[PDB]
Every structure is written in C-alpha cells, then in structure tokens.
Design a binder for this molecule. Structure first.
Ligand SMILES: *[C@@H]1O[C@H](CO)[C@@H](O[C@@H]2O[C@H](CO)[C@@H](O[C@@H]3O[C@H](CO[C@H]4O[C@H](CO[C@H]5O[C@H](CO)[C@@H](O)[C@H](O)[C@@H]5O)[C@@H](O)[C@H](O[C@H]5O[C@H](CO)[C@@H](O)[C@H](O)[C@@H]5O)[C@@H]4O)[C@@H](O)[C@H](O[C@H]4O[C@H](CO)[C@@H](O)[C@H](O)[C@@H]4O[C@H]4O[C@H](CO)[C@@H](O)[C@H](O)[C@@H]4O[C@H]4O[C@H](CO)[C@@H](O)[C@H](O)[C@@H]4O)[C@@H]3O)[C@H](O)[C@H]2NC(C)=O)[C@H](O)[C@H]1NC(C)=O
Ligand SMILES: *[C@@H]1O[C@H](CO)[C@@H](O[C@@H]2O[C@H](CO)[C@@H](O[C@@H]3O[C@H](CO[C@H]4O[C@H](CO[C@H]5O[C@H](CO)[C@@H](O)[C@H](O)[C@@H]5O)[C@@H](O)[C@H](O[C@H]5O[C@H](CO)[C@@H](O)[C@H](O)[C@@H]5O)[C@@H]4O)[C@@H](O)[C@H](O[C@H]4O[C@H](CO)[C@@H](O)[C@H](O)[C@@H]4O[C@H]4O[C@H](CO)[C@@H](O)[C@H](O)[C@@H]4O)[C@@H]3O)[C@H](O)[C@H]2NC(C)=O)[C@H](O)[C@H]1NC(C)=O
Lengths: 48, 59, 204
C-alpha cells in the first residue's frame, strides 16, 4: 500500500497486487475498413 | 444466382454418398447467407440436412 | 409442424392454410410444383419477396401461423410447405399442404382391388394392389384392413398422378406373407376421398 500523504484524503492511494488478476476486454463488433480516398495521396479509414 | 448440383445419381448401400454444389452469381465468402442442403424423399415432405459458414466470431 | 393434408378452391376465391407449432416469428412458407424445385413465397411471417404477387400474405396468431392466397389461378396449383426456426439454430418443416386449382367437375373415386395370383403365392409372396382413379381433388388417403382390424404393416402408398382425361389416379401396394393371407379370409381396402370412403374386399 503506497500513498504520498495517507491521512490526507486529497492524495491518491497506490496499491500493488501479489497475484495477477485475469482481465478480458473485447470489441464484440466485427468490423470492416472503408479506406475512403481523400487525396491527393491521403487516404482515410472510415468505420464501415 | 444459380445453384447447380453435381454427383453420382446411383449409389450402393452402406457406401459414402458425395455431392457437390456449384454456385453461380454469388460468393460463398459473403456473410449474408448460410450454405447447405435440403433433401426431399420421393412423394414426401421437406427435411433439413444442415448448413455452415466460415464467417466466425472471437471464440 | 402440423400442416393440413389438403386444400381446394375455385378461381377467384381466397384460401387460408394454417400451420401450428411455431412459437417464434421465423415462420416461412414454400411452393413446390410437381416435378420441380420448391420456391419461397413468403418469409418473416407477412413479408413478401421479389416477384411475388401481393395476394400472398403470411399471418401468425398465437402458436398458429397462417398463409392466405386470394384470387386463385392455374399456376397456384402445387404443394405448400411451412417452416420456421426453433430454439437456437435448428429448423423444421411441416408435412405440407396440397392445394389444387384444377378445373371442374368433382367426381367420386373408383377402386379395383386385385388379390394375389396363383403364380405369385408359389414364389412365397403375397401382394394386394388397390387401384384408385377418376377422382377430384388429386389427394386421397388409403387404408387397409384384414377382416375387421386394420393393417398397419406392408403399406406402400404413392402420390397420385393426372391422367389423359385430367382425372387423378393412384395405387397402393400391400405386400405380406402367404401365411397371413390364407389365414385371414377377407381383406378390406378403405379409400377415403373428401370425407366419404370407398371400400373393396377380396377373399380366396
Ligand atoms: C469477421 O468478419 C469477417 C468478414 O468481414 C470474417 O472474415 C472472413 O473469415 C473467413 C474465415 O477465415 C475467410 O475465409 C478464408 O478465406 C481464405 C482466403 O482468403 C482470401 O481470399 C478470399 C476470397 O477471395 C475471392 O473472393 C472475393 C469475393 O468474391 C474476390 O473479391 C477475390 O478477388 C477472390 O476471387 C478473400 O475474401 C480474402 O480477403 C480477406 O482477407 C484480406 C486480407 O488477406 C482482407 O484484406 C479482406 O478484406 C478479406 O477480409 C483473402 O484474400 C482461406 O484461405 C481460408 O481457409 C483457411 O482458413 C479457415 C479459417 O480461417 C479454415 O477453416 C480453412 O480450413 C482453411 O484452413 C486451411 O487452409 C489454409 C490455407 O488455405 C491453411 O493455412 C490452414 O492451416 C488449413 O490447412 C489445413 O487444413 C485443411 C483442412 O481444413 C487441410 O486440407 C490442409 O492440408 C491443412 O491440414 C478461409 O476460408 C474470409 O475470407 C474472411 N473475409 C470475408 C470477407 O469473409 C471473420 O471470420 C469474422 N470473424 C472474425 C473473428 O474475424
Ligand atoms: C500530510 O497530511 C497530514 C494529514 O493528512 C497533515 O497533517 C496536518 O498537519 C497540520 C500542520 O500543518 C495540522 O494542523 C496543525 O495542528 C496543530 C495541532 O492542533 C491540534 O492540537 C491542538 C492542541 O492539542 C493539545 O492541547 C489540548 C488542550 O490541552 C489537548 O486537549 C490535546 O489533547 C493536545 O494535548 C489543538 O488546539 C487543535 O485543535 C484546533 O485545531 C483543529 C484543527 O483545525 C480544530 O479542528 C479544533 O477545533 C481546534 O480549532 C488540534 O487538535 C496546530 O497547533 C496548528 O496550528 C498552527 O498552524 C495554523 C495554520 O494551520 C496557524 O493558524 C496556527 O496559529 C498554528 O500556528 C502556531 O504554531 C506554529 C508552530 O509552533 C507557530 O510557528 C505559529 O506562529 C503559531 O504559534 C495546525 O493547525 C493538522 O491538524 C494535520 N492534520 C490532521 C488531520 O490532524 C500534514 O500537514 C500533511 N503534510 C504534508 C507534507 O503533506
């Protein structure tokens, strides 16, 4: 348990874990890239 | 869009029946529809066989 | 899914065929002409596909799904199957409803029953054939009986076919052993046409 000033509630409290916690973050949307052409030479990737 | 069936019209019992469909005018890669078979016994009702698709998910 | 066996109507009239066992809205109906491939006439209940007349309309009330064809015509004569998604991804089909828009006039069937021959019994085989013809509509169910109790075994019935006189005809084949043929005196063949039945009997 780590904090700059503990009794002070204005200071954040940094915590360091012993065992790692498994976390899953996914994007349950299967997408496609438009890759529209806004030239000359430049190409923007739109969300299809 | 046209579907053309091809294969042996006469097969012996206990053997392996193989049939192949040739699609025309559309891609099997398309995620809009599934592809499979439906068999209709002579003078009988329609029976569903099965279908699949490569368009998958994360698991 | 339970689909009514038959359905009839005159040109211009409206026919409504039902289907049950559908708890979901995935219900769909198909039209299959004899000697041809099935074609989807409706999907997602009421919704119509491309090149399909407005007179075809799907409907579902409670557990019952219904198709309605108004303004009947010659090309509407075919077998109509219904189907729907169930549970997770499986799909099933009904027995189908045969709708006929054939021309007049209606007529009682005609049954001719032939007992096995003398040469056939010598081959240790016994087969009785019911010949049904000259009936309207073209859908008929056939039943067999040995003495009084019915016969559930050896029954082969095929879909009727139109004749040169435009009257439908069908034949049911009963194949059994010569032992049960000689034991039971009379064999009855029941032919049910539009409620009314026509019966024939043969004994050696
Ligand atoms: C999310 O959605 C997307 C769609 O938006 C889904 O993406 C689809 O995923 C499926 C499944 O993987 C892909 O099918 C694979 O196809 C490849 C070939 O892909 C190339 O060709 C495709 C067809 O191009 C043709 O048609 C188009 C359209 O008409 C036309 O324009 C073109 O000119 C051409 O005529 C292209 O579509 C495809 O483009 C894709 O990729 C591009 C980048 O490459 C990208 O820019 C595009 O935008 C597009 O996304 C590409 O050019 C097949 O090779 C592959 O088959 C292998 O893989 C599958 C699993 O993926 C496996 O089941 C198969 O069995 C097979 O695996 C065997 O073969 C491999 C070699 O071929 C080998 O390496 C394997 O080890 C394995 O071999 C072993 O097993 C076999 C038996 O299985 C055995 O015989 C061997 O000896 C050995 O033991 C796939 O079928 C789609 O292409 C893809 N895209 C689309 C648009 O559908 C995605 O799935 C969804 N889900 C997720 C989670 O993302
Ligand atoms: C990290 O965080 C921590 C906390 O998270 C921070 O700690 C905080 O530190 C500050 C210091 O800057 C503290 O404030 C200071 O508190 C002291 C002590 O006050 C207490 O005790 C007093 C006396 O107690 C004894 O006496 C009684 C009576 O007999 C007994 O019953 C007791 O048991 C004791 O024996 C008492 O008077 C105090 O009460 C008063 O104050 C509180 C707090 O405000 C009120 O609630 C009360 O109602 C009451 O009013 C208290 O209980 C004080 O002495 C300090 O005052 C100096 O500073 C003032 C400015 O803030 C200034 O105005 C005053 O005049 C006074 O200055 C005097 O003293 C200087 C030094 O000698 C002289 O130079 C000067 O000239 C003048 O003479 C001050 O208020 C916080 O309390 C403390 N936080 C907590 C929660 O306690 C820390 O700062 C952080 N650090 C870092 C680096 O981040």
């Amino acid at each position: 348990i780590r904090s700059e000033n503990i009794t002070n509630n204005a200071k954040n409290i940094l915590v360091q874990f012993n065992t790692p916690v498994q976390i899953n973050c996914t994007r349950p949307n299967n997408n496609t890239r438009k890759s529209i052409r806004i030239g000359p030479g430049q190409a923007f990737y739109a969300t299809g | 869009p046209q579907l053309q069936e091809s294969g042996p019209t006469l097969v012996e019992a206990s053997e392996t029946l193989s049939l192949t469909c040739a699609v025309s005018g559309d891609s099997t890669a398309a995620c809009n529809s599934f592809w499979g078979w439906v068999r209709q016994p002579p003078g009988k009702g329609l029976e569903w066989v099965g279908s699949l698709s490569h368009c998958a998910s994360y698991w | 899914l339970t689909q009514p066996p038959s359905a009839s109507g005159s040109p211009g009239q409206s026919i409504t065929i039902s289907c049950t066992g559908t708890s979901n809205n995935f219900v769909s109906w198909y039209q299959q002409h004899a000697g041809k491939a099935p074609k989807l006439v409706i999907y997602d209940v009421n919704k119509r596909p491309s090149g399909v007349p407005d007179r075809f309309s799907g409907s579902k009330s409670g557990n019952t799904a219904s198709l309605t064809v108004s303004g009947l015509q010659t090309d509407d004569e075919a077998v109509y199957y219904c189907g729907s998604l169930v549970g997770n991804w499986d799909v099933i089909f009904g027995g189908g409803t045969k709708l006929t828009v054939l021309g007049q006039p209606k007529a009682a069937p005609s049954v001719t029953l032939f007992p096995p021959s003398s040469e056939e019994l010598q081959a240790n085989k016994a087969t009785l054939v019911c010949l049904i013809s000259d009936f309207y509509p073209g859908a008929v169910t056939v039943a067999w009986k040995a003495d009084s109790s019915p016969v559930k075994a050896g029954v082969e019935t095929t879909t009727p076919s139109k004749q040169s006189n435009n009257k439908y005809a069908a034949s049911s084949y009963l194949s059994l052993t010569p032992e049960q043929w000689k034991s039971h005196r009379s064999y009855s063949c029941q032919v049910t046409h539009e409620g009314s039945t026509v019966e024939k009997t043969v004994a050696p």
